Amino acid sequence: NPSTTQARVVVDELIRGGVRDVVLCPGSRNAPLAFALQDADRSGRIRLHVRIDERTAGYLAIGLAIGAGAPVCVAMTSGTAVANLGPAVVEANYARVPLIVLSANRPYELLGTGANQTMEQLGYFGTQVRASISLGLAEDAPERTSALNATWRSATCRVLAAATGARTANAGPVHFDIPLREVTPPGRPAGKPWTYTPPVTFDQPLDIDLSVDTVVISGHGAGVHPNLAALPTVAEPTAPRSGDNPLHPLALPLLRPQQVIMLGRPTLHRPVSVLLADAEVPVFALTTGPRWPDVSGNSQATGTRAVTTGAPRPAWLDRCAAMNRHAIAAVREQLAAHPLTTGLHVAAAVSHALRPGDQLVLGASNPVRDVALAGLDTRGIRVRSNRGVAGIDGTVSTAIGAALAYEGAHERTGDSPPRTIALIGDLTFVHDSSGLLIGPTEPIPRSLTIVVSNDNGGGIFELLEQGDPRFSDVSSRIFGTPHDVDVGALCRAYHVESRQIEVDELGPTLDQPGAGMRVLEVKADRSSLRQLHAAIKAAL
Amino acid sequence: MNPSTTQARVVVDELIRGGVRDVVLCPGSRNAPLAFALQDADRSGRIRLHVRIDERTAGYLAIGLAIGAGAPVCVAMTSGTAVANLGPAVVEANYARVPLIVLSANRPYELLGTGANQTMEQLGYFGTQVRASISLGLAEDAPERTSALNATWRSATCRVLAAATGARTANAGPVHFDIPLREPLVPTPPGRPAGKPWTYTPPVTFDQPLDIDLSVDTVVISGHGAGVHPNLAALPTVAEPTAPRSGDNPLHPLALPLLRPQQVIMLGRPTLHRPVSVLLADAEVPVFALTTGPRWPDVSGNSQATGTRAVTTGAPRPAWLDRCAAMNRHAIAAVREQLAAHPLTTGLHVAAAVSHALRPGDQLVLGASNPVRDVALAGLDTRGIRVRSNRGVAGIDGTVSTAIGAALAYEGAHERTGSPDSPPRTIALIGDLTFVHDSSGLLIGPTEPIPRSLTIVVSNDNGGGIFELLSDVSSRIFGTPHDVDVGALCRAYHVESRQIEVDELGPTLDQPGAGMRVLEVKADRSSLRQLHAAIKAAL
Amino acid sequence: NPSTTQARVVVDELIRGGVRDVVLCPGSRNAPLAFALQDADRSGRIRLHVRIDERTAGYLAIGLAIGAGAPVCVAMTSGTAVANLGPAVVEANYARVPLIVLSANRPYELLGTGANQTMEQLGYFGTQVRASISLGLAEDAPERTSALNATWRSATCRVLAAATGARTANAGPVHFDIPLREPVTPPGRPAGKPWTYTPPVTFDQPLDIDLSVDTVVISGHGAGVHPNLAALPTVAEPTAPRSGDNPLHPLALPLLRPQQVIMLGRPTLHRPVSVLLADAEVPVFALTTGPRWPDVSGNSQATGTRAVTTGAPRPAWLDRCAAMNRHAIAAVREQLAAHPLTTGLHVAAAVSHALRPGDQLVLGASNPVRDVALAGLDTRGIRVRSNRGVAGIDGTVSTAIGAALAYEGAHERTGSSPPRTIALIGDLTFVHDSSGLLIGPTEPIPRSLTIVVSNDNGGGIFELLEQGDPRFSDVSSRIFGTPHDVDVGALCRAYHVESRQIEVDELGPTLDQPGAGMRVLEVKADRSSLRQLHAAIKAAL
Amino acid sequence: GPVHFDIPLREPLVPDPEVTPPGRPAGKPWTYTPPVTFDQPLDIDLSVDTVVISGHGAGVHPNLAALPTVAEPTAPRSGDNPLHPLALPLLRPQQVIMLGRPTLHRPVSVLLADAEVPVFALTTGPRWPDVSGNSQATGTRAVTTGAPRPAWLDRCAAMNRHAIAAVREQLAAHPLTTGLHVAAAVS
Ligand SMILES: Cc1ncc(C[n+]2csc(CCOP(=O)(O)OP(=O)(O)O)c2C)c(N)n1
Ligand SMILES: Cc1ncc(C[n+]2csc(CCOP(=O)(O)OP(=O)(O)O)c2C)c(N)n1
Ligand SMILES: Cc1ncc(C[n+]2csc(CCOP(=O)(O)OP(=O)(O)O)c2C)c(N)n1
Ligand SMILES: [Mn+2]
Ligand SMILES: [Mn+2]
Ligand SMILES: [Mn+2]
């Protein structure tokens, strides 16, 4: 059989290319490269992860990818695989995550006369993936074994480079097909990839004068800019910080910046949106990759670097620092004044408990905002959130995958693995609750703690226009969506340790390692959420 | 003004700020707002407009206007099959990395599925072929929103321009810019101060250094899109005609099989030569791929590495250089002796004569099939001349229009330098089937710009010459000479044309003549196999 | 060889399905089913047409399909094949013509690492085709020849049914891929029957309509025939089949107030028609075949396939409509007589008057198809074609040639001199597809095709519209008139096509004479006066 | 089938403090399209020994009620002559009438996979299943000729009894409750 050789060559090149983890789902036909993948899994060269739910599996792959920054494969086998992987692939595209989807088409069967129970295709692969590469059918030619080895490894390297953005700096999902009919040719010496791609730079310098009153907004994907380290910075949680001059999100409406340097892709805070769209404020977008964020079209220039002249006026820095202290104290004070535990209270407790070396996975909705409003100093901590499309789906498996990948990185350097802490809301937890179902044969994280802040619904709609009390009569059912799930019972069903705790007990519980993967539920209230935010700004 | 008019004038203004000097317009009622705005911009001298009937050849006219001087070019056409006709040029623009903006009018998107006349699935029609598919919002009559609408329209236009020119990706290519338009179609918020683009995105520097040891016996193969590598100038280089040459040590393509290079540096995208293609399919020979953008060719399965430039240790063996230099002379001398010994005139004879007539400063446009390869076999020295050829997919469509657009843009850049000299020559070499196939590219309205110094040389062996160099029942049409009268075609489109024999070619190219003219040279293809077999036996 | 057997089975089942003509273009690689198609063309079982121009080749196939209603294959095999065939496929989709696009993937070759020699893909296949079917590679086991023969013929019948709308009544293009690896026939059903037999189908959606209400019928492209609507005043587009003998001239519509409208097929002509179909005071009843119904304004009251009528039209309404019909015919005829210069409307009137039953008329887009409607041609007994799906001016010469060849082939089967096919196109339309005149001596050539070119050196239709207002006079000339000065005669001579420039009163006698070949008649026409001619017609209504 | 109705929306997204544009009189649809009647008659001769396999989405056929029928649970049964799935591989029908979209049984798939038995596909809509390489024809209903042979009905009835008895006897003798036991209980 020529295909097993091909399959083992591909897997070998994938491993040479930094793939440590592969996610599989069972289905009616054999997974692509399965024997080669189980060969490699037994020998320890690669770590397989099996799940029954295809959708949580794709998000597990995303977590495995963003946990340490490596490409990961997902190889699946059903008439529902393409449909269930859809959400993860859209997130991989928009968040620029290197996710390799493996398929195994069959050139000897008919296509288009009915239902294919591999790869039932939808319409999103055209728009979402960086590349779509299929090897040829492996054929009978001992005579051609050297050339076919050269072709298979080159194409695999082409798949890896497209997914990681090695030459484009635009990482994203790739569709990789290894067709099937139904002593392995060596790669390069010393484990070198067949086609080596040396490091790449994309350089677009923009002139910027810092004497103009300047604020920095940094969002998802933002780079690190040392020449902007001292500027007042409104940094989203997932944005790596350059310096030590934070500007709280709620101080922005009280300031009038003359120009904005926006790093990466922002998605949080309406005052950020209004400032970005203000026609009188020049906006400089510094990002990596082909496109730039600009919902209003108001931006003046895009590039990758700033070349700076001048320095900010001290009165501008002084007043920015003053409003920053004004806003932080307003939140602390009204949190102390507010009686009922809310998700904002939980976020502050989680932030205080964090320490350098931690990984923090944040859910969408109020959790990722609340951490920003709690004012977490994110330096030394690696913050992950699925900001590409900001869905409330797949966050449990994302956190599981990130902790596994981050812990795997801790092993290969030869103490106990670093903590990974996830803060998610109750709806988000319910959405991806099947991520908790992990078989005994599958890898399980050692230091994953998932904090669920449960206000029995979506607290975020209490802060929006539909949260207005003129909508008190109608907002609860179509926006609040209360559900009454028993989180403790759910975690017990999947044999995952869980606990109810109060916000003041959170730090002490998080300190101690705990028996592996655990859930801590904190009860929260969203009826007082609108007033609580009303009180915080009312103190500004 | 009504919304479609304002929006069309905003897009045209931002396109001009973004460096668009030439626009190809195809007639239609739906694109009246853009047609009117484009015409007014042409009358003011801000752009040069070019009206064409046939959208497919118009697309290749846009390509020629783009490759002639390296600017982004926009082609505008109405909804319906006029957009489907841009398909072939878009595929060429994709594979040749040509900044072609396809600006299509459209009906509102909610009219799809309603049986509206002349409406189709336009957005996404080109799929993977384009760098971006961007659509403007149907303009609405909100007089308060006009300032914000102006920002969004100019911003989307800057996104279109950056994707087309590869301003952030370093990978220029076609872009589809779709504007849904509503009635009335028949009749301006300002941009940035000082004529700057609305969103200023400077051209990126894309850098990928790569270590290569030159004491290893090394040959360079440079194809379409190759960059200039001064640290590789001394090396023996098998350079395609469209490849710009770093140095002065050419290596004839037929000399390659007579050599044993220890390693190969591949520049850009090689397309042309069977000895090249064989050598690159040799797993045993290491190939390093250097390119100007993120893409790199899959022609060799043993591409060891990728880069944009080389970091060189060492120098080539003087004996290696001496030997490669000898084999190069040996190869080109075989060609020239077998051409002299050949009784009949062939397209290879015509390409040799054309190469001899060129002078530095000329632009040379080569058609697919035998012309572009015949020029390489004839040993053309390309330094100082700009050589264009549609190497993306190497089809026969649009070659005449590509030669015309390239001449026009090459001449416009020359007026720009301020020289009072005659504009520089553009000389094209295309086969007879290619010329007949795109003969309607000769059509230019009386109002429309006409090249001032374009000579199209048609090498006419009355059929498909390269098929001697070897099937389907599809090949039966080639088994019979077509007998299409090239002269009659040229008068149909009121273009000066003359037959000449091959010795008149040099002297005839030296006299300027009409701004655009066609020189037909009769050739023989019945002896082509004999000639080529005599060349190989002489090596 | 497994591939070889597969190819002859597929070609044999296509023939059984009614495929008479296949269009091929030479390319980088060997066409789909090339050897099987080559054998069948020798036996006279199938007829091949080869062109170098891939765009004109798709429109040639459209013509061969609409000439007699037969499904047509295009086997095209290059890196620009999909791009050039796009216009033809879009037209086949919107006009519902059975166009089977044949391809041949190589599963043993890589995809997506660069340019594809076989099939460089665009984004339109996924939205324009009724189906995408791909055979398996022919596996090499002789125990299963009977099993593989059944699978291949079943799949080929599935391709044909999708293309002809045999079960859906929604004909259109389908993509048929027969994969291949470089480098006696299992028999089909007895008596030449298709492997999977699709007996006749009916989609029945009756709509209740009261004809006592003042009713007008607008029938367009794809319209059916309705005997219970034969008496109604009917504004019929030239491609629409007539159900009755009570026509209503398009220019007479704005002079009347129908209380309700029955719309047949897909209307694409006349602004008074679109205004009336959009009038919220007028209930519109759409009777079409197929899944969708035309309704740009969304004003339509109901859609179905058939009408169940009560009552009859008031005789006052009939005489009112008949009287406006007469005034409209009178206005066109007199103002044409009173106009000194020859326009395309003059040419369209002359072509109409020369037509006789049994003719095939092929109408180009723009003014020609409208002008024939303005001349009040009686389309009964006439087969009228026009590419109204997208109404492009591209590909019309090959569409006329293909339709002439298909219509002549059906006549050759009767055993009976071939019937006339007469084409009327504008000069821009001719210039667009002039390369379609290039037919090799190896290739089928019509015997009775006369292409009439009405040449006003530009697009005359833009004189009539928004851009034709004299206030726009300076700019509009260049961007809408698009004059070109092409010498049609020199162009035809270059392609060895008999051609002559004649005055319009010579048109009738010349068309009656047998030209015994494919030929091109050119009539010089003026468009500078087109706007005032039409204004004079309207004033005489 | 499913359709995708996408609605672009922008702020303000919530109602303003309170006039809805009306539809047609009398609650009628804006554009009224009655449900189509899709009809494709197909001649079948029932004296040839026939089995009926009914899949998901199968129609109801009175003129086929006498024929031995293997009907999936979702198939709306119309006949009075059931044939158990396990009796199919012990029968050799001369022709097969296939209703709707069969999906459930391997022997059904095996029988339909055989290229030697003619299959007639009777469906409710334009689609028809490709599970059989030897589908002679398609229809919506059958125009029957003849009647099933008495000897053929006896065999099918006889093998049907065996299959029912085998399942019933072997469930009764099995020591452990299985999912098949749960299914019979629910049934
Ligand atoms: C898949 C998906 N569905 C719906 C939404 C819209 N949405 C955004 S936030 C939110 C509420 C999330 O509630 P929860 O996770 O409990 O967080 P909380 O706001 O209560 O802290 C919803 C439904 C989404 N972002 N993704
Ligand atoms: C491999 C390949 N073969 C054929 C074609 C189509 N094609 C390309 S060149 C050609 C004939 C070229 O003839 P001509 O233009 O006279 O130039 P010559 O080769 O005779 O010099 C054809 C049919 C193609 N696109 N690709
Ligand atoms: C491919 C394509 N491009 C552009 C158009 C827009 N268009 C419609 S009519 C027309 C003018 C046609 O001129 P001609 O064929 O000479 O007919 P005339 O108006 O002179 O009667 C144009 C350009 C179209 N319908 N199809
Ligand atoms: Mn909640
Ligand atoms: Mn030639
Ligand atoms: Mn005209």
Side-chain angles (χ1 to χ4, degrees), chain C residues 11 15 19-22 37 40-42 44-48:
Chain C
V11 163
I15 296 171
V19 177
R20 313 263 180 197
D21 300 271
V22 187
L37 287 169
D41 181 53
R42 315 320 98 156
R45 282 184 83 208
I46 212 166
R47 179 168 63 172
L48 299 185

Side-chain angles (χ1 to χ4, degrees), chain B residues 481-504:
Chain B
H482 52 89
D483 291 332
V484 183
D485 181 4
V486 177
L489 274 175
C490 292
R491 339 185 187 292
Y493 306 110
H494 296 302
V495 179
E496 175 181 311
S497 89
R498 294 145 58 192
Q499 322 195 207
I500 63 172
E501 326 195 65
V502 69
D503 321 292
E504 291 162 80

Side-chain angles (χ1 to χ4, degrees), chain D residues 123-148:
Chain D
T123 59
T124 268
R127 281 174 177 188
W128 83 92
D130 73 319
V131 310
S132 178
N134 192 23
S135 278
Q136 292 227 340
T138 59
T140 57
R141 67 197 156 93
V143 183
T144 51
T145 268

Side-chain angles (χ1 to χ4, degrees), chain A residues 59 343-344 363-370 389-394 424-431 452-463 479-481 483 526 529:
Chain A
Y59 280 108
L344 186 50
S365 198
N366 272 339
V368 69
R369 307 180 167 57
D370 289 331
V389 203
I392 63 170
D393 50 325
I424 57 176
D426 58 284
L427 297 185
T428 298
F429 171 81
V430 173
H431 212 292
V452 178
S453 162
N454 187 352
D455 49 29
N456 187 34
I460 193 165
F461 303 114
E462 288 293 311
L463 301 165
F479 298 107
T481 80
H483 49 73
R526 61 189 177 77
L529 212 31

Side-chain angles (χ1 to χ4, degrees), chain C residues 463-484:
Chain C
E463 301 296 332
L464 273 44
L465 300 177
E466 323 312 327
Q467 323 89 301
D469 188 319
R471 56 174 277 201
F472 295 109
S473 164
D474 292 355
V475 169
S476 252
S477 154
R478 191 187 157 179
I479 61 176
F480 296 109
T482 63
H484 53 87

Side-chain angles (χ1 to χ4, degrees), chain A residues 81-255 257-444:
Chain A
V82 173
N84 268 309
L85 284 172
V89 168
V90 175
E91 175 61 25
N93 171 32
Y94 279 86
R96 297 199 268 143
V97 173
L99 163 78
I100 302 187
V101 176
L102 298 153
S103 69
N105 268 109
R106 276 165 319 275
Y108 286 87
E109 296 163 9
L110 279 171
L111 253 57
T113 60
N116 193 34
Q117 211 261 357
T118 182
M119 178 175 284
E120 258 299 311
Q121 281 278 71
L122 277 85
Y124 71 81
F125 261 127
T127 58
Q128 299 305 296
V129 297
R130 309 281 178 276
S132 191
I133 297 172
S134 52
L135 303 189
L137 271 189
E139 43 165 46
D140 284 346
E143 332 167 309
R144 291 302 286 230
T145 318
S146 172
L148 280 156
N149 183 65
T151 290
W152 294 333
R153 291 185 186 271
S154 275
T156 295
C157 277
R158 197 172 286 278
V159 170
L160 279 155
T164 59
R167 294 200 90 202
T168 64
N170 188 38
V174 168
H175 180 232
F176 190 11
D177 182 85
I178 298 85
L180 193 52
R181 181 168 195 177
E182 161 251 310
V183 59
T184 171
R188 304 267 160 114
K192 258 72 170 73
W194 188 261
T195 299
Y196 170 60
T197 84
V200 138
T201 63
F202 288 81
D203 200 61
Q204 287 178 278
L206 300 172
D207 298 323
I208 298 176
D209 180 67
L210 295 193
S211 67
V212 199
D213 291 343
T214 304
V215 61
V216 176
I217 314 307
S218 58
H220 211 67
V224 178
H225 298 258
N227 66 349
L228 313 176
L231 296 180
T233 302
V234 193
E236 282 186 7
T238 56
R241 261 169 232 195
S242 305
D244 64 332
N245 188 4
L247 184 55
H248 195 280
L250 299 172
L252 260 190
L254 321 177
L255 300 150
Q258 298 176 284
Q259 84 187 346
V260 175
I261 301 175
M262 162 172 95
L263 313 178
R265 182 191 175 214
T267 40
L268 303 171
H269 319 306
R270 283 186 202 174
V272 169
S273 285
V274 174
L275 178 54
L276 285 178
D278 189 330
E280 279 165 297
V281 189
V283 171
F284 300 89
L286 302 184
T287 169
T288 92
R291 288 184 313 255
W292 63 91
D294 194 0
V295 179
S296 73
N298 183 46
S299 285
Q300 182 167 108
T302 83
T304 67
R305 276 199 293 121
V307 166
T308 72
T309 56
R313 319 173 304 112
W316 169 247
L317 284 179
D318 167 70
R319 154 161 175 119
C320 278
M323 301 298 339
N324 173 65
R325 287 189 308 265
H326 187 51
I328 52 96
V331 163
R332 312 221 143 109
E333 145 175 69
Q334 291 303 328
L335 286 180
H338 200 76
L340 303 155
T341 288
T342 73
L344 186 50
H345 290 96
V346 189
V350 167
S351 326
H352 200 236
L354 290 157
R355 76 208 180 202
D358 278 346
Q359 168 169 236
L360 168 82
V361 177
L362 298 181
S365 198
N366 272 339
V368 69
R369 307 180 167 57
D370 289 331
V371 168
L373 298 174
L376 168 70
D377 174 5
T378 55
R379 296 175 293 173
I381 303 170
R382 37 210 66 172
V383 184
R384 323 293 193 196
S385 194
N386 287 340
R387 300 314 299 164
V389 203
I392 63 170
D393 50 325
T395 313
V396 176
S397 282
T398 299
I400 289 160
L404 288 168
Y406 189 43
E407 279 157 34
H410 167 95
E411 262 216 314
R412 269 177 309 272
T413 168
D415 307 308
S416 206
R419 284 186 310 177
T420 298
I421 299 150
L423 176 61
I424 57 176
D426 58 284
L427 297 185
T428 298
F429 171 81
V430 173
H431 212 292
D432 194 38
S433 52
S434 163
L436 297 159
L437 170 45
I438 309 175
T441 53
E442 310 311 314
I444 305 193

Side-chain angles (χ1 to χ4, degrees), chain B residues 220-224 226 237-241 243-245 265-270:
Chain B
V220 179
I221 301 188
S222 55
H224 196 68
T237 292
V238 191
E240 283 183 5
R245 300 212 206 129
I265 302 180
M266 178 173 71
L267 307 185
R269 191 169 161 267

